[PDB]
Design a protein around this ligand. Structure first.
Ligand SMILES: *[C@@H]1O[C@H](CO)[C@@H](O[C@@H]2O[C@H](CO)[C@@H](O[C@@H]3O[C@H](CO)[C@@H](O)[C@H](O[C@H]4O[C@H](CO)[C@@H](O)[C@H](O)[C@@H]4O)[C@@H]3O)[C@H](O)[C@H]2NC(C)=O)[C@H](O)[C@H]1NC(C)=O
Ligand SMILES: *[C@@H]1O[C@H](CO)[C@@H](O[C@@H]2O[C@H](CO)[C@@H](O[C@@H]3O[C@H](CO)[C@@H](O)[C@H](O[C@H]4O[C@H](CO)[C@@H](O)[C@H](O)[C@@H]4O)[C@@H]3O)[C@H](O)[C@H]2NC(C)=O)[C@H](O)[C@H]1NC(C)=O
Ligand SMILES: *[C@@H]1O[C@H](CO)[C@@H](O[C@@H]2O[C@H](CO)[C@@H](O)[C@H](O)[C@H]2NC(C)=O)[C@H](O)[C@H]1NC(C)=O
Ligand SMILES: *[C@@H]1O[C@H](CO)[C@@H](O)[C@H](O)[C@H]1NC(C)=O
Ligand SMILES: *[C@@H]1O[C@H](CO)[C@@H](O)[C@H](O)[C@H]1NC(C)=O
Ligand SMILES: *[C@@H]1O[C@H](CO)[C@@H](O)[C@H](O)[C@H]1NC(C)=O
Ligand SMILES: *[C@@H]1O[C@H](CO)[C@@H](O)[C@H](O)[C@H]1NC(C)=O
Lengths: 47, 500, 499, 44
C-alpha cells in the first residue's frame, strides 16, 4: 500500500517522511509525532 | 444546551506518526464531537480499533474522507448532512478510498443510515472490496441534482460476506442488515408540491424550505438540520434583522427577535473582538471603503472619508491563500503595514527555501519590514526565527493580537522551538481572544514573569508556558528581570524590557 | 410585458368635485392598472357611466371600497386577490355600502368572478337593494378563517329583478348570469392533505403553500397569485437579499440574484420614480427617517445626517393622520424638521381655530417654525395666510417639492387666495412632478416672471397662474423685477429674490 | 337617505352643508362649489 518515495521529494515533508500511495499515485507524508498538516508543517498545539 | 463542536482536519492521506499516534490524535479530535467545522478525515484506522466515538457526529461542514482503513466498521450512524463547504480533490464532499488490507480485507460496514443530504459537491467510491450494501444506495436522493454528472462511484466486492437488504428496504436500498438500515428517502419520493425535503409521499408531508436533511413537521422549527442559519430552535434563511420598516409609521422599528449573524448562527451579541456592522452582522474585516474603529467599546465599520489606508492581508487568505509562511516571495507585500488583516506564519521552511513552491530562502534582514506592525487581527504563529537573533526583534512594536482566527482553532499566540533567550514583546498590551503557548524554546528565560491574565479580553483564555529553559537554569545564569523593574515581570534582561 | 401598477387612493367618502370631475379622476387613476399598491376606491359613479376600465384590475394591496354608486354594473371581473395591507374602518378589506339611488334603483351587478382570496380583513355588504346574484357566495373560501367573526353582511333585494344563478355553479352560487360567473371554489373543497388552496377535490390538485388564490399546477411557479412575494415566475416567502453573510468567511458577499422589494414583487432595478432603501425596500417616498439622494446613479434614501437636521411626516399622516391643516396644536411638532415625508396643508381653519377638535387659532409667528424645511415629499397647499405678511417668508429655504403626492393626484404647488405681494420662494430650485396653480392672489406680482421650465422635472408639467395682480398694474405702481434681474425672473422686488 | 345633522354638528363643515347618512350612520359635508375635503375644507 505505502512505498518509499523517490529521493527527489526529500524536502517535501517539513516534519516527517515522504510516503507514496500506489492507489492514489500521489505523494503524502508520515508526520513526526507532534506535527500535522499535509506537509507536516504545523506543530500540533495542545491545551 | 448546544452542539458539541470539534475543529476537523485537513490532512488528506497524510499519516500522523505511527498508526497508534494517528489513531490517538483522531480520537482526541472527535471524542464527543457533534458538529465538524472542517473536514472529517478517517484514515489508517486498523482492525479492531474501537471507533464508537464517531457515533455522536451529526453534521460535517467540510468534506468526509474515509481512506486507507483496515478496520471493519466505521459507525457514522448519526451523520445527517455533509455540507461540502470544502471539497476533497476539487469535486467531492464524500470520498471513500482504498479501505482494504494486504490480505484484501478491510472496511466492510459503513452504516450511515441518517446521511440524507449532501449540500454541495459530488461523491467518490473506489477500491473498497470488503464493503457491504453501499452500492444499493440511491444517491439521487442524497446528492444535489447539480453534481450528479461529477459523481464517480464503482463497488466491486469479491470478499463477499455481505448480506441482502431487509425486504422492507425500498428498491433494495440499505446501509446495513436490519430494517433500521433501510435507506430513508426524503427528496425523490416527494409530492409535486414540495419545493424541499419531505417526510413522505403525501402533500401534507412537505418540509419547510429551510430544512436540510428532512423534518418531523411542516414548520421551520421541525427541521432535522438547518440548511443555512440556526436561530435558537429554528432554521432560517437569514438572521432576523435588528430593525424592520414600518408602513404606517414610515420609520424604522426595532425588532425584539432581531439577532446578529455569526458563523451559521444567529446570536444576541457579537464577540467583543469581532467587527459589528451597522446592518447587524459579526465580521472579521472591513469591506471596501469601510474601515475599522470602535465607536463605543464595540468594533464598528465606517467608510473612509477618502481612499482607505492600505490593507495587508494575512498569510492563509487573499493572495496568500495557500502560502505556508511569510517568505522571500511574499514579504515585500508587507513593507509598511501597520496592521495585519488575518494571521502571520513564520516556519523553518521560510529560511531553508522550498523548491516545491518555488520559494528561495528568506534573507533574515527582510524580517525587519515587520517592525511597522502594531496590530494582528488573527493569530501569530512563530515556529522558526533567525537563529543568530536572541529575541523577536521584528515584533518589538506589536501591541494587539485580536484572535479572530486561531491556530488549530485555539491559539492566538504560538511561539515554539526557537533558540531565542527572550520574547522581547515590550509593546504587546492586549490579546483579545485565544490561548497562548510558549513551549520548546530551550533557551527562553523570562516568559513566566509576565502576568498574562492582564492581556486577556475574553473569558477562558489560558496559557501553556512550558518546556522552555527551566527557571532554575535561568536564575543560575543571571537571566531574570532587571532590578529597576521588580513588580510585574519583563520581556528580557534589560530595563526597557520590563513591563510598565 | 410587466404588469401595470397604480398608486391607489385614500379619499374614502370624499367626493372630488361634481359627479363628472370625480368619475374622470377615478378614470385616469385606474386606467389600465392591473395591480394597485394602495386602495381601490369606487364612489359616486352615476348611472350610464362606463366602468369598463376596471376589467384590467387583478389585485389590490390595500382595501376595496365601493360606496354610494348608482351605476348599474361595476365590472371587477378579474380581481383575484385583496391583500388587506390596510383596512376600511380598521376591520374591512372589502366594503360595499349604500349603492342605491333615491328612486331605490342602484348597483345591480358585481361580477367579481375571480375574487378568490382575501388574505387579511373582513367584509361588509350593507344597503344594496338592486344587487342580487351576490347573496349566493360563501366567504370562508374567500376570507381567512381568522376574520369570519368580524365579517358582517346583510342582503335584501326589493323586486327580485335579477335572475337565477346558473346550475353549473356549486350550490347555486355565482356573481352573475351565465356559467362564466359561477363561483370558483379553491379552498373549502380541498382534500385534508392540501396545506392551502387547491385546484380541485383530489390530493394531486393541492397547490404549493406559497400560492394565494389558486394554481394551474403543482409547483410553486404555478400559482395564480403569490401569498407573499413573486420573484419573476415563482412565489416565495421573501425577496433574496442583495448581500449575504458567508458562514465560513465571516464576511458579507454581494448576492447576484438578490432583488429589492416592489409591492409584492422582487426586481433587480427599482421602477422609475422609485428609490431603494438600504434594507432592501424599494419605495417612492422616503418616509424613513432617512432622506433621498442619487448615489452611484441610483436614489439612496439615506439617513438624516449632515444636511438633514430632522425628518417629519406630512399632514394627514401618522402623527397628523387626521389633521386638516398645519394648526396651533401640531405646528410645534414641525420644529427643526428639515424634510416633510408627505403633504403640507395650510387652511383657513388654522387661523380661525376649531372647537370641534379643541384646536385654538394659530399664532402667525409660529409659521417661522417652517423656516428649516428644505424638501417636501408631497405637495405644498397654501389656501390661507396672515394678511399683514408680504411673502411666504416661512418657506424662504424650501428647495424641493417631490410631488409624490399631488392634491387630487395632480397639483404639487398651490398658492391660492392670499393677500401676499410676492411668493418669496427664493430657495425653490426644483419641482420634480405635478402642476403649479397660483390664483386668487389679488396683490401678487412677480409670479409670471419665473421660468418654470427650469424647475420642472417631468414631461407635461403645466402652469395655471391667473386672476392675480396684472402685469400692467404692477409696472405702473413700480413693483417689478430688480433691474439686475433678467430672463430668470424674480421671486420678489429685492435682489435677494432674484433668479 | 339624508337626515339632518345635529346641532352638535353645528360647526362641522368648513364650506358645505352637513347631511347625515342613515345607512353609514355618520356625518358628511356637501361641499360648496369651488371647495372640497372631508369637511369641504379644500379649494379645487
Ligand atoms: C511562499 O509564498 C508564496 C507566495 O505567497 C507561496 O507560493 C504559492 O504556492 C502555492 C502552491 O504552490 C500556489 O497556489 C497555487 O495556485 C495555482 C494558481 O492556479 C493553483 O493552480 C494551485 O492549485 C493547487 O491547489 C489547489 C487548491 O485550491 C488545487 O485545487 C490544485 O489541484 C493544486 O494542487 C495552487 O492553489 C500559489 O499560486 C503561490 N503563490 C504565488 C502567488 O506565487 C509559497 O507556497 C510560500 N512558501 C511556502 C513554504 O508555502
Ligand atoms: C389639528 O391638529 C390636531 C392634532 O394633530 C388634530 O387633532 C386630531 O384630530 C383627529 C380627528 O380630527 C383625531 O383622530 C381621532 O382619533 C380618535 C381616537 O380614537 C379616533 O377614534 C378618531 O376616529 C374618528 O372616526 C371614527 C370612525 O367614525 C370614529 O369612530 C371616531 O369617534 C372618530 O370620530 C380619529 O382618528 C386625533 O386624535 C387628534 N389629535 C391628534 C394628535 O391627532 C386636528 O384634527 C387638526 N386639525 C384641526 C382643524 O384641528
Ligand atoms: C387610457 O389609456 C388608453 C390606452 O393607452 C388611452 O387611449 C389611447 O389614447 C392615446 C392618446 O392619448 C392614443 O394614442 C391611443 O390610440 C388610445 N388608445 C387606443 C385604443 O387607440 C386613453 O387616452 C387613456 N385615458 C386617459 C384618461 O387619457
Ligand atoms: C472523551 O471525553 C469523555 C467525556 O469528557 C472522557 O470521559 C473520555 O476520557 C474521553 N475519551 C478520550 C479517550 O478522549
Ligand atoms: C551566525 O553566527 C555564526 C557564528 O559562527 C556565523 O557562522 C553565521 O554565519 C551567522 N548566521 C547569520 C545568519 O548571521
Ligand atoms: C541557537 O543558539 C545559538 C546562539 O548562541 C546559535 O548559534 C545556534 O545556531 C542556535 N541553535 C539552535 C539549536 O537553534
Ligand atoms: C375585529 O377583528 C379583530 C381581530 O381581527 C377582533 O379582535 C375584534 O374584536 C373585531 N372587532 C369587531 C367589532 O368585531
Amino acid at each position: 500500500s505505502i512505498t518509499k518515495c523517490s529521493s527527489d521529494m526529500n524536502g517535501y515533508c517539513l516534519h516527517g517522511q515522504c510516503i507514496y500511495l500506489v492507489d492514489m499515485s500521489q505523494n503524502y507524508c508520515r508526520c513526526e509525532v507532534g506535527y500535522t498538516g499535509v506537509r507536516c508543517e504545523h506543530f500540533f498545539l495542545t491545551v | 444546551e448546544e452542539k458539541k463542536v470539534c475543529q476537523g482536519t485537513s490532512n488528506k492521506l497524510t499519516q500522523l506518526g505511527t498508526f497508534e499516534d494517528h489513531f490517538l490524535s483522531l480520537q482526541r479530535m472527535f471524542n464527543n464531537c457533534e458538529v465538524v467545522l472542517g473536514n472529517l478525515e478517517i484514515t489508517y484506522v486498523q482492525r479492531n480499533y474501537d471507533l464508537s466515538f464517531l457515533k455522536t457526529i451529526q453534521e460535517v461542514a467540510g468534506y468526509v474522507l474515509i481512506a486507507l482503513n483496515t478496520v471493519e466498521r466505521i459507525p457514522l450512524e448519526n451523520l445527517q448532512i455533509i455540507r461540502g463547504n470544502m471539497y476533497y480533490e476539487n469535486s467531492y464532499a464524500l470520498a471513500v478510498l482504498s479501505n482494504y488490507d494486504a490480505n484484501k480485507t478491510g472496511l466492510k460496514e459503513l452504516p450511515m443510515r441518517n446521511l440524507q443530504e449532501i449540500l454541495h459537491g459530488a461523491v467518490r467510491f473506489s477500491n473498497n472490496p470488503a464493503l457491504c450494501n453501499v452500492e444499493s444506495i440511491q444517491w439521487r436522493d442524497i446528492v444535489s441534482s447539480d453534481f450528479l454528472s461529477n459523481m464517480s462511484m464503482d463497488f466491486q466486492n469479491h470478499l463477499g460476506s455481505c448480506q441482502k437488504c431487509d425486504p422492507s428496504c425500498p428498491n433494495g436500498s440499505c446501509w446495513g442488515a436490519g430494517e433500521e438500515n433501510c435507506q430513508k428517502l426524503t427528496k425523490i419520493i416527494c409530492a409535486q408540491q414540495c419545493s424541499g425535503r419531505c417526510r413522505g409521499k403525501s402533500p401534507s408531508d412537505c418540509c419547510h424550505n429551510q430544512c436540510a436533511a428532512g423534518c418531523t413537521g411542516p414548520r421551520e422549527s421541525d427541521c432535522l438540520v438547518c440548511r443555512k442559519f440556526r436561530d435558537e430552535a429554528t432554521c432560517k434563511d437569514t438572521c432576523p434583522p435588528l430593525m424592520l420598516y414600518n408602513p404606517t409609521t414610515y420609520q424604522m422599528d426595532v425588532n425584539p427577535e432581531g439577532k446578529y449573524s455569526f458563523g451559521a448562527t444567529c446570536v444576541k451579541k457579537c464577540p467583543r473582538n469581532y467587527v459589528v456592522t451597522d446592518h447587524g452582522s459579526c465580521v472579521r474585516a472591513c469591506g471596501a471603503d469601510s474601515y475599522e474603529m470602535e465607536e463605543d467599546g464595540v468594533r464598528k465599520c465606517k467608510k473612509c472619508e477618502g481612499p482607505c489606508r492600505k490593507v495587508c492581508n494575512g498569510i492563509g487568505i487573499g493572495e496568500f491563500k495557500d502560502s505556508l509562511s511569510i517568505n522571500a516571495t511574499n514579504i515585500k507585500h508587507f513593507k509598511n503595514c501597520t496592521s495585519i488583516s488575518g494571521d502571520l506564519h513564520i516556519l523553518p521552511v521560510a529560511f531553508r527555501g522550498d523548491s516545491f513552491t518555488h520559494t528561495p530562502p528568506l534573507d533574515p534582514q527582510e524580517l525587519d519590514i515587520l517592525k511597522t506592525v502594531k496590530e494582528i487581527t488573527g493569530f501569530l504563529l512563530i515556529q522558526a526565527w533567525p537563529e543568530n537573533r536572541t529575541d523577536l526583534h521584528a515584533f518589538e512594536n506589536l501591541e494587539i493580537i485580536r484572535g479572530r482566527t486561531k491556530q488549530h482553532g485555539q491559539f492566538s499566540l504560538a511561539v515554539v522551538s526557537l533558540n531565542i533567550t527572550s520574547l522581547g514583546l515590550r509593546s504587546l498590551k492586549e490579546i483579545s481572544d485565544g490561548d497562548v503557548i510558549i513551549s520548546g524554546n530551550k533557551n527562553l528565560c523570562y516568559a513566566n514573569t509576565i502576568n498574562w491574565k492582564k492581556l486577556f479580553g475574553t473569558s477562558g483564555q489560558k496559557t501553556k508556558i512550558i518546556s522552555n529553559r527551566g527557571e532554575n537554569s535561568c536564575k543560575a545564569t543571571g537571566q531574570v528581570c532587571h532590578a529597576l523593574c521588580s513588580p510585574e515581570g519583563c520581556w528580557g534582561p534589560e530595563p526597557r524590557d520590563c513591563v510598565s
